[PDB]
Amino acid sequence: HMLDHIGFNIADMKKSRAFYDAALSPLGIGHAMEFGDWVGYGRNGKPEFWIGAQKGAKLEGVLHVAFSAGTRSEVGRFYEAAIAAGGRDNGKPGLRPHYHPDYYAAFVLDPDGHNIEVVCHLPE
Amino acid sequence: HMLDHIGFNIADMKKSRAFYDAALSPLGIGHAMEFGDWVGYGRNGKPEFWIGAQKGAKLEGVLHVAFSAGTRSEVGRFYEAAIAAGGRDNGKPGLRPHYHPDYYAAFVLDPDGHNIEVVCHLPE
Ligand SMILES: N[C@@H](CCC(=O)N[C@@H](CS)C(=O)NCC(=O)O)C(=O)O
Ligand SMILES: N[C@@H](CCC(=O)N[C@@H](CS)C(=O)NCC(=O)O)C(=O)O
Ligand SMILES: [Zn+2]
Ligand SMILES: [Zn+2]
Numbered sequence: 001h002m003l004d005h006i007g008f009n010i011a012d013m014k015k016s017r018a019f020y021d022a023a024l025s026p027l028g029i030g031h032a033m034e035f036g037d038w039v040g041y042g043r044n045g046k047p048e049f050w051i052g053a054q055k056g057a058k059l060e061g062v063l064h065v066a067f068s069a070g071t072r073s074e075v076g077r078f079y080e081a082a083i084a085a086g087g088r089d090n091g092k093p094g095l096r097p098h099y100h101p102d103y104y105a106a107f108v109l110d111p112d113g114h115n116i117e118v119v120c121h122l123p124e
Numbered sequence: 125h126m127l128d129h130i131g132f133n134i135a136d137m138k139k140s141r142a143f144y145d146a147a148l149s150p151l152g153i154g155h156a157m158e159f160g161d162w163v164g165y166g167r168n169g170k171p172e173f174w175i176g177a178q179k180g181a182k183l184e185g186v187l188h189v190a191f192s193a194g195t196r197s198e199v200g201r202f203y204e205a206a207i208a209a210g211g212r213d214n215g216k217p218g219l220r221p222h223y224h225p226d227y228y229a230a231f232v233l234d235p236d237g238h239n240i241e242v243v244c245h246l247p248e
Binding site for chain 1: 125126127128129130132133151153165166167172173174181183184185186187188189190191192243245
């Protein structure tokens with residue numbers, strides 16, 4: 001994999017932490033680490049996804065982040081949990097064959113409007 | 125790995141494409157794919173890092189993206205190439221032991237001010 005980690009600031013840590021806690025839980029993802037004023041999500045102690053809430057530093061415009069799912073069931077569970085936590089629909093779980101024949105994904109906007117996806121690339 | 129891919133808009137495709145072409149080349153990373161109005165960087169046909177240049181849609185604020193290096197030599201070569209292409213220094217190649225004892229990295233700002241890192245986590 002070419003991506004090691006990413007990080008960005010959001011408006012409100014309480015709100016964003018709650019969203020990502022709920023959204024990423026079905027992927028077996030939790031707080032891999034909390035370094036200073038950042039919260040790092042990851043699996044098996046390896047953080048890859050960092051959010052911060054530095055005053056005035058929040059990202060503006062839409063960032064797209066896609067997380068990897070091992071199963072289509074995980075895609076669906078991410079979606080349900082993210083919506084329930086206040087995420088806004090940006091595309092229901094389903095095949096996206098215009099990308100490739102086995103691309104199965106769902107899209108939810110986070111509290112700052114970022115386009116958060118979970119995708120499985122495998123046939124089932 | 126939990127990150128599948130990311131994407132965001134930048135101000136000027138010619139400038140950003142040139143920067144990332146130069147910066148990511150030492151990692152064996154090139155244009156894995158060009159889908160519509162986006163440019164996808166990746167290795168072995170698998171795009172992970174997408175940039176676009178939609179009018180008015182550019183990301184504002186600082187995004188941090190770190191790419192994985194297999195060797196410390198690669199970290200250094202990324203840095204030299206990124207600087208030569210007009211990147212701004214945000215941290216020279218070297219150990220960052222305050223992260224962990226084998227963390228070796230360099231940081232360069234892209235044309236839009238994003239904090240681009242290449243990191244090797246292995247002892248050498
Ligand atoms: N509503 C669409 C969302 C598709 C989407 O957001 N795709 C990602 C890339 S995988 C993206 O950033 N698209 C930007 C665009 O399509 O303009 C769906 O349900 O498929
Ligand atoms: N100038 C520093 C840059 C360190 C840096 O940018 N670290 C990343 C995380 S690996 C970051 O986003 N840091 C934000 C901060 O330290 O406030 C260096 O050379 O080490
Ligand atoms: Zn996507
Ligand atoms: Zn970093």
